[PDB]
Every structure is written in structure tokens, then in C-alpha cells.
Assembly symmetry: D2
Homo-oligomer: 325 residues x 4
């Protein structure tokens, strides 16, 4: 009736001909070796390092330097600041691919997010379920060296340059987890809608900052050509509205003809939660950050229990107010 | 002026003739080997297992069975419930010493607490600083097999039977962290007072439940004889008051002549925070559970920032209320 | 530097050739008699009754029956419900003009608003200042009997049929007071902007309800012809945005060519307060409903003081939660 | 099942041989005239003035000057400050009895309390019900001039010197209303207990301030002899505890042998509300200060509705925080 959903972060352990390397056997083996890490991974273990070969490091260096050249003019400020933090503390550079375990430690200390190696495109419900615990299911393999500027699937370049930097921002990290919180136990229809909102924000969203249009969608930030086109006069840009985006069809191959612009991440977050209010449901969930668990609020008592945590917090703020006078 | 205090859980890495085994060289080497783990330990690593020798396991089995016999009549209910949870999920039993890493995982998922192997009695400020991040500095060695019923220092028996079970209770875990939060940057005088409140609660506190007196202090719960005496007609028992306890002298060797009884953990917690209000300070701290960091609240802006987290939470509770009607 | 503003509701006591009756001396005397009540009125006194002459009652009956015929199709639901409440409990009918004192008692018990007899169009700052205490400065005289369907100035018909019913709704009443709260001590420039937002909402606002467009602006609800035109294909209707409305020029004589539509009163209220955030100011005000006073929040301490009221309230909600389980 | 209780302040309109003037017919007529005002009074009307005769004014002057001499040494600070405010703004003096209507206006603007003339000792439930709306049922007649220093019943001296000044303090006013809120719809047994808590606090309570014992109970503050005895070595003084006080027997004629001392009004208020939590009830009430109504919280929806008021308020405090930086 209500599909199953994880309630503890532990439980996430239960959750082509045209491809540039389809006819490379050395590459198809590198992959199986890398997917291997995702398949044997359990919550709580340090993510195993991958020793990238010089050519892999070379594909990274091209994607990196090229996109790096567009960020100052095309990216939202959250991306620039997070990309700068990654360079300062997580060894981001053009001559070496970062290790997931070092990036995860960096995200845990900045916004509480963490990474989990994944074998390649997860089911929509499992992906959003993971976002609910501030866990980003992340690929560890690189795109075939023959087409560095273009990748069908999400590779580590797309993950580490496209997603990770925005996850270092407090407000965006909360927006992402909110989409995942909203999806827990939701119907398949509601999962597809949420996946679509996700597509038009986390993946291909645009935002307005000091009158200028800027990208924040990972699919834009890890794509040289799409990045230039998203800010051009060619696609149509609509005001972000969770309801409108949820039913906007879209496709995978070519650039997007339509994008949604949010006014601010706090505005989009507010619009996403009023949207989540209207989702048909006999309960609500609230994340418990101390234990990485999902509390189900389905009675006056469970709501009262969380309220108590909130009243303790307000007590702390009252004390801070006398302390500073 | 304000002493240094950790603001990230990472930073905790910067924080006798009469002894039953003083004249045992095999034991004095077991220790150095065990202290070794504490000294080489860094935040975030799985805590290294210790292979306990049959006799060590034998000392454990005696302390365990003996105290286990008093719990139903002498221990507070939080201890009984947590001890039961430990048996059900953390393999507590008389024939094997539990591994710190399995107990820590258990605490992380229950109350967000975690353990850290420590070499033996830490400085007061560093100990309370650690409590601020819900980190319990925990010994890993066992008491000399010659005097199983008595141990000068805190050994793993005292830690795992005395402290751990109460840390599995939501309210007590928050009380402990509160003492640590209150101690951050406090003066040496204020550290000694807080250490004393800690002594009379976490270590030797008594509480009243359904008109009956019961123990919750770890030093009582891991001590056969003291446990019986604390509930007898011999010592004096006073109503718990943070101010009164902070200046009560006490000693280490013999049983305590005076104990403090709290009415409920929520009552004691409330009394401890009004106490923390009166501590001379130009700021307050609030724990950020998503990143295991300490936020210093020293301006209208930092207070506003935390308030926003609280307002998001209240939004979640409002939504839970419509969802259940 | 910061203009003076009332801080107690008591202090409000310190705050044409073309006209249809310009050449009626009996009418010009009725007015002076009525303005008289406004000029001698002090906060806290019952508002003096006015004995309306049969013809006055006749002008009322025409305006009433005519507009009454459009409400079911043109008015927002808040107006219909409040107009129904007024009929049920405040004797609204076509054959007698209601007395301000009975309407005020009705508003006090429904939303806490109250009326105050006013002599005729107040200064912008004084008008908005009054709205801050949930006091609606209200005219008591009727429009000249020669042109019942049209009135230059706000008469009692415009006040009692146009404004009063929306003030009976909890959310709209809070929106109105918010505009007044925001105006306290604000610069003249900021008063004109707020007056303009007021013009496009309270006076001539439109709102959308179940996909249909509806009026809520008093100037629409007390105007037969404007009411029909505001919902027609003739004027331009723009999405409500406090920033855009504040600088929209407008005029007095003819119908409005442009109106703003809010999605919901809660949405408009939220948009009005984010607008009020960006108003240049070294303080904020919060209404104290127990004493009808304005608290100025200009230090950590005054903010702490109000927080305490809020924490008491949250304590009440926690108790209500256990009571209902 | 649940007795009826007012939900609107309007509804309060539905709620001896040894006596010094029993054998005075001129006095017994003065009374009937004064009781008259209470019987014909309706909520919202200005309280009718009483023209006190010179001798009445003379009894007042004696009680006033005598007690006035003990306040600096025997009264809590809230009483001294409120008595000073009354002198500064409400014409308190030894040569004229204050008018209820001027005192009520004073209380409305200070703490939101108001007075209502009452004929003489009301039923316990009706008295506490009135306290729920911050309405103090107050006598308007004076004690017989023959025994100025002693009065069986509560006269205007007892009300205006004993009660009124404490009602001018924000925290005490909230404590009093809380007792009334707690009594709404409660059983007769629960009314008697609450009446007893009221007796030992509002009427005869003692409090501790800077290590010194002080009175705040109206029955103490309007009684020369009891005032001296309550602070002497003769009666027993117990720590205030709502549970203990509720079942303490007491009598009317002689001084009290036992009193309860609260540590602070905020402490007593907190202890009174935990007491109110344990009262058997399927709902909770919350006062709506804008309309002087009682909201019954008996479902997730009604609780959600009040929560929204609280979230608006927290929004105001967030804005005040940026405004002051
Ligand atoms: Fe992606
Ligand atoms: Fe210990
Ligand atoms: Fe108007
Ligand atoms: Fe009394």
C-alpha cells in the first residue's frame, strides 16, 4: 500500500553500440573492476581507492581544464565557492582524479553529505531514497578516453565536477535531501514526478543571481556545450515551479530546449516543500541527523517527540541571546 | 582569555604500588599493547579489535554475572532497557568481551554517540570537550584477573557495563553531551565544577522512579559493593541541584557517603541547563549534528542562522500535522 | 532620523466642485455633525451611534442590493463568508445602516481588529500606523443620495461592504496588520511604496481560487462597475509581487487598467514579509496582542524577551499533543 | 462529562454575626448599592465609578499607610515596582480610593489583565475561568470603618493593594492566567486542588529573592499582621511544589501556620505547568490574545493552526536578528 522505504542509513545496502568504449575490451574490464567496488561496498566502510591510469587521468585533465574555463562566467556562485573549497582542501586539480573517500570526508564536514560508490544509474526510488539520508550514490569510473568532451552516462567527471561542488552549499544540500525526504514511500507516479523536478533542478536547473542568469544543474556544469547553450538565447527559460516542472517531458540525448530558473535556493526550497505538502500521504518523515535515521511522524506522540528536540534548540538560542547581551 | 576548544570532531585528535597487576609483567605488556591502539587512533577509523585471552574473558565473565544479578533490583529502567538492547544486538554475554567498534556502531544508530579508544583517564577539559561531540573516550583493556570485583581505574568492564547502556537512552545521552557543551572554552574553575557535577550524576547519580530509588551512575552500575551501598540506609542522599553538587568534595578510594537523586532525566537536564546559563561567557555553542561540529553563537547573525534550521523543522511538524489530519 | 511612530494603541489619538453634494447645505451639515464624532473620539470609548435619516438609509439600500447581486460570482470566498457572518451576527441588511460600534465588537471577537471613526482620508503614515494595531480608521457618513452608484471618497458603504468583510478573515487581517507593522518608522519613500502595495492589494487586489479569478480589494467590492471590469478581458492582470506593485503608478478617477493577482493570502503574506525584510532598518517591531503595544526589537535582549513568549506557546502545543495522545 | 467553560471573554457574563458592620444599616445599604454595579455589569463597559464617602476614604488611608510602611522590607520586588507604577500612573495615594476603571486601563496596558466588578466571593470554577481570560473579578466596596486593620472578606483594599500590583508583573500575570487556563473544564476535584494551589501562591505565597524571603501573596500584602508573621520564625515554610500545595489543608480565620516559597516566578510557572500536564484531559486550551478567546486544541488540525501563529512569530524574530546585524 505504502511501498517500503529505508528508515536507517544502513538499509541503503538493500537499495551501448553508440558508447565510445563499447569496442574496447581493456576499458570494459576496467569498468567491471570499478563496478566491483560498488557491488561489494557496505555502509560505513572507507570507500576503496582506485589507482587511475595515466590516460584516465588525461581524460579527466581535459574535461577539467575545459569546463574550468567557463565556471567564472557561467556558474552560480555556490558552485564557484564549493569548487574553490574542493581545490583548497580536497586536492582538486587537472593532473589527478580525486578519490571518493577524500571527497566524502570533505562533504561530511561541510554539509553532512557523504558519498557511496554506485555501479551506474540506480532506480529512481532508490536514488531519491539515498538522497533522503544525505547520501549521494556516486560513480567511480571515467568516460572512455576517445570522447572526453562527451559522455552518455554519468561518470566520475560528471559527479565530481557537476554535483559535488553544489552539495558543499548548506541550502542546496538541504534542497536535495528534501527531494529525497519527499519521495520516501511515495507512489511510483509520485516518484516519476519527483525525478522530473530533480531533472530540472539538481541536474539542469538555472538560477538568477544579481539580475544574471547562471547554471547550477550538474548536467550543465559537467557539460561544455550544454553549459554555453543553457545561458544562450536558444532554449526557453521558465520560472521554476515544482508543479510545472514535474510534468515537463524531457529527453536524454540532445541539449534541453526548456529550463527552469529559480530566484534563490531558499525560494526554490520553499516552493519544493509547499509541493511536498500536496503529496497524498498519511504521514511525514523527518530526518534524525544524530543517528542518520528517518523518523516517521504518524501520530500526535511521534510529532510531540520531535517537537521536544526543537524546544531544546530554542532553549539554546535563548541562552545565546543573553550571552551576547 | 577563552581557552581553545575543538569546533570539529576531527580536532579531538589533538585532545600504582597498590594496583593488582603492578607486579605482573605479562599484564603490564598487555596494557602497553592495548594503550597502543588509543595512541595510534585517528577520528573516523574503525576501532581496532582486541583478541582477548581466555583469562581476560574470565575476569569479564565474573564482573558480568555478579553485577547482572543486581540490575533488576538496583538499576534505573534506562539501564535495564539499554542492557537488554546491547544483549539483543551487540552480543553482550558472559563468555566474551564485546569489541568497541561493534558497541560504537550500536550507539551511533541509537543515540548518535560513538566511542573512541583512550589510553587511561584523560584531562577533565579534554574529556568533557569529547562529550560535546557525543564521543565517549573509552578504555579497551581489562582489570587484572586477581581482583575481578575491584578496579582502581576505569577498565572496559566499567565502560561497557557502567556507561554504555545509559548512553543508549535519548534523554541521558543529551544530558551527557550538554555537560560537555557547557564546558567548551570554560575556565579551569568552571571545568572542575562541571567535572564535579559529572561525578555526581554520570558516575554516581541516583534517580527516583515510581517512588523507588535507583542507580544510573556508571561507577555504581559497574560496582557490586557500591551498588548495594548506594541504595542502603548508610549514605546521605540529597535532591540533585547542579549548584550544590558542583562544590561537594568527594574522594576516589572508598564508597561515596553522599549521593544526589534526580527526579527524572528531563528534570535533571533542565536543572543542568539553567546552571549552564549562569556560566560567565560571551557566547553559547550549539551542536551541528549534520557535520559533528560546534557552532559558536556570538552575534545576531550566527543566532539567526541556527534559528533558520529550527524554523525548517517546525515547517516539517506543521506538515506532519495536516498529514495525520 | 527615524520618524516617530506610536508604540501603544492609546497613541493613535495623536495620529469638491464635482462632488454630488457640494451644493446641498443640509448634507454639508450632516457631514460636519458626523466628522464631529471622529474629532471628539478617544481610544477605548464605545463609538457613538449615528441615527441615519431615511434617505441615507435609502442610498445604503441601493448600493447594498446592487453589489450584493455580484458577490456570489465576483467575490473571493473570504468576502462571501465574512459577509454571511456579518448578516448573521451584525445585522447587515438592506433596510438599515450598521452602527460602527456593533461592527467593531464583531471584528474584535473574530480577528482582533477594531474600528475607529475617522473624519476622511488620513495621512498615509498615520493610516498604516493604525493598521499596525489592528485598528481600521473608518468613515461614518454616507455618500450623497444623488449618485448612489458612485462615490469619490470612501464613505461608510465602501468601508462596511468593501473592507470589513475581508477583515473578518484570519489570514487577511494578519496581511493588513503586516503592512502597517512594516510601515512603522519607515521613511516617507518607504511609506509611499507601502501605500502602493496597499492600493494594489487591500483596495484593488485580485486573487485566484480554484482556477478562477476573484476580487478582494475593497475598492472593487464596493464598486458595481469596477467590480465587473476587474474580472473582464479589459485590464491587464499581473502576478502579485510587492516589489513590482510598490512602483506601479495608479490614479484615482477611472477604473484601474492594471491589477495584481495573488495565489493565496498566505502566499501574498509570505511575499509581503520577504519584502518587508529588505526595508532599510536598524530594528524590527512585533505586536504585543495582550497590551495592544508595539515592541521594538533592537537588541539581543528584546529579541530574547519575545522568544520566551514563543517558547511558552510551544510548551502549550507539546502538552496538547500528549492530551490527544 | 466535561463541564461547560467559557470560550469567549463575553461569556463570563454567564459566570455574618461577627462582621464589623453587620449591625450598621447605613453600611449594609452602601453595600447593596455597590453590589448593584457588579450585578448590572456586562463585558466591555467602562466600570462605573463609585463616589467614596470621606469615612470610606479614611478607612482606605489607614490600611494604606500602615501596609505601605512594611512593603520596603517585606514585599517582593515585583510588588514594589508595580506599587510604584500604580502611584506614578494610576493615582494611588492615601487620601483617595482608586477607581476600578482607571486600574483596569492601567493593567490592560501593562500586562493585558483587566478588572471586572464582582459582588463578593465567586464560585471557585467561575473565578479560575475568569483568570483564564486575564480578567480579575474585583470587589468595589470598602471594609467597615470600625476595624480598618482587619477584614473577613476581600474588600477593595485587599484587591487594590494586595492583588493588583503583582498583576502588573509580566511573569506573575502569566502564572495567574495559567492557573485559570488549567482549570477550564476540569473536574470539581481538580478545581479544589487548583483553588488550593492558588491559595498558597496568589493569596499567601512567599518567594526567595537574593537569599531573602519575601511575600507576594495578596492575602499577605493587604494584611499588616500576617505580613509580619509570614516572614517570622513562627510558621513552617516549605519549598513550593504544586502537588504538595494542592492537598495542604488550610483555614480562613487565623494566620497560616504553613507557607510555600517559590525560587522565582519563572520556576513556579514551570512547576505549575508540568503540574497542569498531569491533569486528566482529552484536550488542551491556548489563549488567543487577539480575540480574548480560548482555543480548544483537540485534534492535529487545531494544533497545526496555533503552530502557524508561532511560526509567523519566529519569522519576525529572524527578521529582527538581521536588522540588528
Ligand atoms: Fe547527474
Ligand atoms: Fe567512569
Ligand atoms: Fe478604502
Ligand atoms: Fe484575594
Amino acid at each position: 500500500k505504502v511501498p517500503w522505504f529505508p528508515r536507517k542509513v544502513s538499509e541503503l545496502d538493500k537499495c551501448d553500440l553508440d558508447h565510445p568504449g563499447f569496442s574496447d575490451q581493456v576499458y570494459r574490464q576496467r569498468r567491471k573492476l570499478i563496478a566491483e567496488i560498488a557491488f561489494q561496498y557496505k555502509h560505513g566502510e572507507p570507500i576503496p581507492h582506485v589507482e587511475y591510469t595515466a590516460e584516465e587521468i588525461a581524460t579527466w585533465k581535459e574535461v577539467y581544464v575545459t569546463l574550468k574555463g567557463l565556471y567564472a562566467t557561467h556558474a552560480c556562485r555556490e558552485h564557484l565557492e564549493g569548487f574553490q573549497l574542493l581545490e583548497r582542501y580536497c586536492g582538486y586539480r587537472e593532473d589527478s582524479i580525486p578519490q571518493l573517500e577524500d571527497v566524502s570526508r570533505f562533504l561530511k564536514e561541510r554539509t553532512g553529505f557523504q558519498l557511496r560508490p554506485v555501479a551506474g544509474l540506480l532506480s529512481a526510488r532508490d536514488f531519491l531514497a539515498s538522497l533522503a539520508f544525505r547520501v549521494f550514490q556516486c560513480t567511480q569510473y571515467i568516460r572512455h578516453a576517445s570522447s572526453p568532451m562527451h559522455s552518455p552516462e554519468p561518470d566520475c567527471c560528471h559527479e565530481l565536477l557537476g554535483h559535488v561542488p553544489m552539495l558543499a552549499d548548506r541550502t542546496f544540500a538541504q534542497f536535495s535531501q528534501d527531494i529525497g525526504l519527499a519521495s520516501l514511500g511515495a507512489s511510483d507516479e509520485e516518484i516519476e514526478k519527483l525525478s522530473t523536478v530533480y531533472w530540472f533542478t539538481v541536474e539542469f536547473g538555472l538560477c538568477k543571481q544579481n539580475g544574471e542568469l547562471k547554471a547550477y544543474g550538474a548536467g550543465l556544469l559537467s557539460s561544455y556545450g550544454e553549459l554555453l547553450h543553457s545561458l544562450s538565447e536558444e532554449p526557453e527559460v521558465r520560472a521554476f515551479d515544482p508543479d510545472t516542472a514535474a510534468v515537463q517531458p524531457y529527453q536524454d540525448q540532445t541539449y534541453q530546449p526548456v529550463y527552469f530558473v529559480s530566484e534563490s535556493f531558499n525560494d526554490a526550497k520553499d516552493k519544493l516543500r509547499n509541493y511536498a505538502s500536496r503529496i497524498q500521504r498519511p504521514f511525514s518523515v523527518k530526518f534524525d541527523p544524530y543517528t542518520l535515521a528517518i523518523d516517521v511522524l504518524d501520530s500526535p506522540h511521534t510529532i510531540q517527540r520531535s517537537l521536544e528536540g526543537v524546544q531544546d534548540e530554542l532553549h539554546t538560542l535563548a541562552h545565546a541571546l543573553s550571552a551576547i547581551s
